[PDB]
Swiss-Prot record, chain A:
It is found in: Cytoplasm; Endosome membrane. GO terms for molecular function: phosphatidylinositol-3-phosphate binding; ubiquitin binding; zinc ion binding. Component of the endosomal sorting required for transport complex II (ESCRT-II), which consists of 2 copies of VPS25, 1 copy of SNF8, and 1 copy of VPS36. The ESCRT-II complex interacts directly with the VPS20 subunit of the ESCRT-III complex. Binds ubiquitin. It comes from Saccharomyces cerevisiae (strain ATCC 204508 / S288c) (Baker's yeast). The keyword Repeat applies. It comes from the Eukaryota. GO terms for biological process: ATP export; cytoplasm to vacuole targeting by the Cvt pathway; macroautophagy; negative regulation of transcription by RNA polymerase II; protein retention in Golgi apparatus; protein targeting to vacuole; protein transport to vacuole involved in ubiquitin-dependent protein catabolic process via the multivesicular body sorting pathway; ubiquitin-dependent protein catabolic process via the multivesicular body sorting pathway. The gene is VPS36. Keywords: Cytoplasm, Endosome, Membrane, Metal-binding, Protein transport, Repeat, Transport, Zinc, Zinc-finger. Coiled coil: none annotated. The keyword Iron does not apply. The chain holds residues 396 to 566 of 566 of the full protein. This is Vacuolar protein-sorting-associated protein 36.
UniProtKB/Swiss-Prot annotation, chain B:
This is Vacuolar-sorting protein SNF8. The gene is SNF8. The keyword Signal does not apply. It is found in: Cytoplasm; Endosome membrane. Belongs to the SNF8 family. It is a peripheral membrane protein. Present with 1040 molecules/cell in log phase SD medium. InterPro entries: ESCRT-2_cplx_Snf8 (IPR016689), Snf8/Vps36 (IPR040608), WH-like_DNA-bd_sf (IPR036388), WH_DNA-bd_sf (IPR036390).
From Swiss-Prot, chains C, D:
Keywords: Cytoplasm, Endosome, Membrane, Protein transport, Transport. One of its GO terms (molecular function) is structural molecule activity. The keyword Cell inner membrane does not apply. This is Vacuolar protein-sorting-associated protein 25. It holds the Pfam family ESCRT-II. Component of the ESCRT-II complex (endosomal sorting complex required for transport II), which is required for multivesicular body (MVB) formation and sorting of endosomal cargo proteins into MVBs. The MVB pathway mediates delivery of transmembrane proteins into the lumen of the lysosome for degradation. The ESCRT-II complex is probably involved in the recruitment of the ESCRT-III complex. Its main location: cytoplasm. GO terms for cellular component: cytosol; ESCRT II complex. It is found in: Cytoplasm; Endosome membrane. Belongs to the VPS25 family. The keyword S-adenosyl-L-methionine does not apply. Disulfide bonds: none annotated.
Amino acid sequence: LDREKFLNKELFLDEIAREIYEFTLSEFKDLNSDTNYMIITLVDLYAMYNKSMRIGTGLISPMEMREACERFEHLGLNELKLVKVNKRILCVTSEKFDVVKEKLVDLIGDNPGSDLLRLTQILSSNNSKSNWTLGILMEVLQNCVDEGDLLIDKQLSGIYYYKNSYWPSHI
Amino acid sequence: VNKTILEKQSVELRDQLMVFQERLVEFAKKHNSELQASPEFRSKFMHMCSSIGIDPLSLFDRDKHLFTVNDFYYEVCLKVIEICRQTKDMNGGVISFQELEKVHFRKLNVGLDDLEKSIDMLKSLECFEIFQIRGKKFLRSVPNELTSDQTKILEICSILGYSSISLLKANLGWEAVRSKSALDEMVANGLLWIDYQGGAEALYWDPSWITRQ
Amino acid sequence: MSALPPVYSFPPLYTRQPNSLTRRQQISTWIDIISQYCKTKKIWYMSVDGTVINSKNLFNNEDIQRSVSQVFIDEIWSQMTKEGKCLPIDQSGRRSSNTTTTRYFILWKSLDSWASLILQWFEDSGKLNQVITLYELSEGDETVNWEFHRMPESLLYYCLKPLCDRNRATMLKDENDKVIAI
Amino acid sequence: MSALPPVYSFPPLYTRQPNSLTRRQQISTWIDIISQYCKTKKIWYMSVDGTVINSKNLFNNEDIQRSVSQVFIDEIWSQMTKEGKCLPIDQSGRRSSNTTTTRYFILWKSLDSWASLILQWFEDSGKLNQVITLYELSEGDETVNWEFHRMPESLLYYCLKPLCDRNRATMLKDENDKVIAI
């Protein structure tokens, strides 16, 4: 199919991008709802994209994974965007951050006191297709913690999260 | 118009370098096509391109022969990712390069210099930070760096592996409370392992000890 | 019992919240229950352990769960010192951040509002020119529809110091231990 | 490769770890050492004390520092059971949490898989017609780099039992016996 047959570096990427955009979209959309999303930390994406698609087809430099995804908007692959959200979060999503932030928050507003080990299971199960990989979970969590969107309870036992309901911080 | 002096070297030196890149890729494609399998020979050859000022990774581009060598460097980058996910419980998000070298990779012929590069590649995904301790490098998979307090603790855990409330009071000259308050912080966050059997105090251990011997 | 607000069964109240803005909020709310506990109960002072006797600790006495740190409490104390309503103490109301500021003390009214209501004893009864002391007004015969009974030895002293820079109603001392006339 | 998994000489391994996450790993580590010690050496069973003769103890062979609270060691075994490769014995392989579950057992292979391996003695050697006993494949003559030599009384039994899904190879029973044919 496509390894080192491509001479034009650019055209390669242009097509690599097309491949991923289709990979990810494959990895979720049920088309029974448009309430379904995907956030992936880029690193976690590169983990699987490569592992699954490109093993034996030719492998990818992260430098090229980053450059690839950076140009969806240009090739008119509009359902999925790549963005840096604070200093640290670098990820690809189907929706606004804020909109996905709020989603998680309110789920805790239903499942309060819960900690990651449980929040893992409950939210993202194996065959329950909500598409929260682990990596992006912690990254978002930590986020809403800073902006004051989510409240905490540290014990040795581990960290425990709650929803901000007595306190301020307007959208 | 000043022709004679300056360009006598420019013209001459320019061709020296460019035409050498070809000589370079030759030794690599011809002889060190067994480079794909030698962690030392890499670090040798790559320390030249660095000196000239060449991305060695770029020399590999045109050839079938040399496009395995990249494919190794990525293979690795793909393992480092994986490592960091499996350990995230053990070490709480941070691993010594020590661990990476000797433990997880000694199994697949990979050397510290190789790794180091891989990690400089993954700077691309804006992912892990690095940080040094008493001078040794570490690799931070989690989403926030360690307070000034936290770092010092580790510095103290470099020698023995653990750190008492007393131990803090004694070496760095820390308080009683400031220490334990900021020391229990650490176990919430999975970084340190507690050990109660230790005596009057509990001691707080650093998963890294294990690795270095 | 107002003293037990719902906000206090809430575990995050007992964990120094990281967010700058959301903390000021957290801080302001500890202040409000400390305020209410001491108003709705007889208590006057509270140690920096956060204990009291009328023996409970407000912060840890949360035994139905788990409790909270003292590296934080200072941060809470300091905000209630600045624009809040407390003064540190060892015995005397004076302060040195070590010896003389172990235990803490709190007010519902201010000292200029608390000095202004014991002046509404002697305006409303006409017992001005007479001389009484701390021992007399605090316990025994001055416990009425006025709650300043059991104002300890050192608050009486410092509570009624707005009246040296106000009208200057005289007060008296045996080698720095007090008693007042108006 | 060893019974000296480096991680193992590490003190706080033996303390019950409070971070709910750290534990996940703590326990799964322990399990990994165990299995691969009975695998590293010829060993087969281990008592709930943590005892093992080939005499010394895992949760306290590292007594040369410290050792494990049995309270916990029990928490562990039950994960090792839950999905793992351990099973509760006394004499006969069965289990009642008191009498019949004092000693414990573990494999590195599965039951299904270890059963799959004398399917290989007798499928690649074509010894399917024979009748042999437990006493005969375990010591004396069937010691080849096939390691099942020394698989005990009640386990050889248990691990041949899976040969039956709907089809199998046969086994014999009496007041007097316990033996197998293919």
